[PDB]
Structures are given as structure tokens and as C-alpha cells.
């Protein structure tokens, strides 16, 4: 799986998170957020 | 990898796990998941339709 | 795909994007009819979902 | 292990701890419980109709 | 006893939490959670 969001709102909700927010999954109404099983986006890009 | 888009969730068992977070403005377009915002190799968002 | 497809199961946990998870590591080695029964057959449900 | 399913909690004493973290539509399926969800030895939701 | 839920909304809350994710068992009207007495799910499967 890779992170996906029906709307930018939930994407901003996890963008605010300092670490580990991408691993969680959330489903508001018919909108949903697939979790990222491997937080490489949290690290491999941010690790620099 | 793979990313779903367009999946519906049942209304009879639909729910709100994050009422405390976002407060979406009501619109029929926000109900059906026509699009799935994603990512790029650089951090960003990548819309698809 | 079906719009009704479950997301909380099939898409959150890793699985074969075929819609029916299967492995030769799970199927008995050196087999054909019961091995193809593990995959393309439907009367015998696969593992995972 | 054991897990009940289909139990009817009393209506006169019905309550809601932690209301802020969840919200539900007023569909009948959200009212009367029917099908439990569980997990496999690898974690994943596991419905039991 | 082990984990039990009715609506997915309760399962998403028990999953979103970190340490002690199954330490408690919330009730919501007719829906209810039943947390496991032994946290084999929280750590054992993941710990290896």
C-alpha cells in the first residue's frame, strides 16, 4: 500500500504530524486514507 | 505498489473517525471519491482522476 | 474494480493485487490440478480474505 | 479465546464514553449491532457475518 | 477474552492508538469494544 487521500483535508491532517502520522489510516465518511506500511516517505525523503 | 481510487464505503455502516480534526464543507462532490491525492518522489501531493 | 470493494481489509494489509492472494509457498510443491484449484478456482476460498 | 456477537446493550442505561473521537450516521445498522470485527494472527480486520 | 468490536469506527480508534492500544474497552450506545486481557496483539505479533 501507498498513502492515498480522497481530499486534501486529511492530507493536511497528516502533513501537520511531526512523525508517524503517515503510518496511521483514517476514513472520514466516504473519504479515506490508506496508511503507508513502510514510512519511507517520512524518512527517506526527510532523512536527507 | 498500488493505490486504490473510487472505492465507496457503505452508508449504513459509514462513520467518522476524525470529527475532531477536519470540518469539511458540505457538498455532494465531497461524498463520492472521484479523485485520490497522492505523493511525488519529492514531498508534495499528486492529484489523479 | 467493483466500487463496493472493501478498503479496510484488502488495501491496508499487503496482498496480491489480483484480488485473490496466493503463493506457491503455500501451495503443495509439485502439484498442478490442486495447485490451479488454489488460484483460479472459487469454490475453495483462498487464505487472507 | 471467546467473543460475543449480536448482544443488545440496554437502551435505558445506554451511554457513550469518549464521544469526541467518533461519530455515526443515524442509520439503523449503526444502532443495533450485528456483525463483529476481529483480526488474524497478522493484524487485519476480520468480519464475522 | 480477546478483541471485539461492532462498528469499524471503534476498530479504527483502537488501531490508531500507540502504547496501550487495547488497554481499555470503550462503549458507544449499542456498540461496544472488548479489549483483550493479554496484549498478545499489541506487541507479540509485531515484536518478534
Swiss-Prot record, chains A, E:
Protein location: Virion; Host nucleus
Family: Belongs to the herpesviridae major capsid protein family.
Summary of subunit composition and partner proteins: Homomultimer. Makes the hexons and eleven out of twelve pentons. Interacts with triplex proteins 1/TRX1 and 2/TRX2; adjacent capsomers are linked together in groups of three by triplexes, heterotrimeric complexes composed of one molecule of TRX1 and two molecules of TRX2. Interacts with scaffold protein; this interaction allows efficient MCP transport to the host nucleus. Interacts with capsid vertex component 2/CVC2. Interacts with the small capsomere-interacting protein/SCP.
Role, per record: Self-assembles to form an icosahedral capsid with a T=16 symmetry, about 200 nm in diameter, and consisting of 150 hexons and 12 pentons (total of 162 capsomers). Hexons form the edges and faces of the capsid and are each composed of six MCP molecules. In contrast, one penton is found at each of the 12 vertices. Eleven of the pentons are MCP pentamers, while the last vertex is occupied by the portal complex.
Name used for this protein in its record: Major capsid protein
Organism: Human cytomegalovirus (strain AD169)
Name of the gene encoding the protein in the UniProt record: MCP
Residues of the full protein shown: 1323 to 1370 of 1370
Swiss-Prot record, chain C:
Cell location: Virion; Host nucleus
Signal sequence range: none
Superkingdom of origin organism: Viruses
Quaternary organization: Homomultimer. Makes the hexons and eleven out of twelve pentons. Interacts with triplex proteins 1/TRX1 and 2/TRX2; adjacent capsomers are linked together in groups of three by triplexes, heterotrimeric complexes composed of one molecule of TRX1 and two molecules of TRX2. Interacts with scaffold protein; this interaction allows efficient MCP transport to the host nucleus. Interacts with capsid vertex component 2/CVC2. Interacts with the small capsomere-interacting protein/SCP.
Role according to the record: Self-assembles to form an icosahedral capsid with a T=16 symmetry, about 200 nm in diameter, and consisting of 150 hexons and 12 pentons (total of 162 capsomers). Hexons form the edges and faces of the capsid and are each composed of six MCP molecules. In contrast, one penton is found at each of the 12 vertices. Eleven of the pentons are MCP pentamers, while the last vertex is occupied by the portal complex.
Similarity remark: Belongs to the herpesviridae major capsid protein family.
Name of the molecule in the record: Major capsid protein
Name of encoding gene: MCP
Residues of the full protein shown: 1176 to 1224 of 1370
